Design a protein around this ligand. Structure first.
Ligand SMILES: *[C@@H]1O[C@H](CO)[C@@H](O[C@@H]2O[C@H](CO)[C@@H](O)[C@H](O)[C@H]2NC(C)=O)[C@H](O)[C@H]1NC(C)=O
Length: 241
């Protein structure tokens, strides 16, 4: 645990820079071409500039101001999908219904599933290791990116929003998740949130709308003046149907 290899987390996604420029081209040309052209070279440059050659445990939200202003994670009213511990299911649901998760916005699509960090006084990505959230530091560029992006995504929500939660976990709602700490607490009043608790096929559900973790969610939303409807006791096929 010295030099570039000093961190406890996996190193940066190998080939990160090429991956994000490839993804930007796919997004802007093939998947969700926009009203005006975007320059993917410039977006990639802004992404790199946010974190390259800096202390990987001193990341702040402000470091991403330029990048986020370039491509705010905006979704039409009524079409946003939040999710927690249901990644595969939530994205299948959104695809079928023509809705948008955070990973369907430009920046979310770029970064989905990747890791990155730099090193002070170096222009290269650190492929040896990167800060682990728990074992090294929470103020790292990967963690901070998702916090900032998710907050903008939440603030942006209007009309009815849906959250896909895991009915096969003890607690479907985790107050310390990004959804619980950053997204739910930043929904605007008059938003209406519908929560779906979906359990594994062939298995009995483990948490429900009347359980303790959902009471915590209900309390957040009450504070924000957000109407809440909770649906549970269903599996993947019924949910997707
Ligand atoms: C609820 O969460 C569980 C546990 O994370 C999910 O089951 C995991 O699914 C992944 C990918 O399919 C597998 O790699 C793991 O083996 C699974 N773990 C367990 C404990 O089964 C499950 O898919 C989630 N359920 C829903 C409906 O989203």
């Amino acid at each position: 645990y010295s030099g570039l290899n000093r961190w406890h987390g996996a190193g940066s996604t190998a080939d990160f820079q090429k991956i994000i420029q490839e993804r930007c081209d796919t997004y802007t040309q093939t998947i969700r071409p926009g009203s005006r052209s975007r320059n993917c070279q410039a977006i990639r440059q802004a992404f790199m500039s946010a974190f390259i050659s800096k202390d990987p445990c001193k990341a702040t939200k402000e470091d991403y101001n330029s990048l986020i202003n370039l491509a705010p994670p905006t979704v039409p009213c009524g079409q946003q999908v939040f999710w927690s511990k249901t990644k595969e299911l939530a994205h299948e649901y959104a695809k079928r219904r023509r809705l948008m998760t955070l990973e369907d916005t430009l920046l979310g699509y770029l970064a989905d599933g990747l890791r990155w960090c730099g090193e002070p006084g170096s222009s290269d990505l650190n492929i040896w290791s990167c800060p682990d959230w728990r074992k090294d530091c929470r103020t790292n560029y990967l963690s901070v990116f998702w916090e900032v992006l998710s907050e903008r995504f939440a603030e942006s929500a209007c009309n009815t929003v849906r959250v896909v939660l895991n009915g096969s976990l003890e607690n479907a709602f985790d107050s310390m998740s990004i959804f619980g700490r950053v997204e739910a607490p930043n929904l605007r009043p008059q938003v209406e949130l519908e929560a779906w608790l979906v359990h594994d096929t062939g298995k009995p559900p483990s948490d429900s709308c009347s359980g303790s973790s959902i009471r915590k969610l209900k309390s957040i939303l009450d504070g924000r003046n957000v109407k809440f409807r909770c649906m549970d006791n269903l599996s993947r096929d019924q949910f997707l149907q």
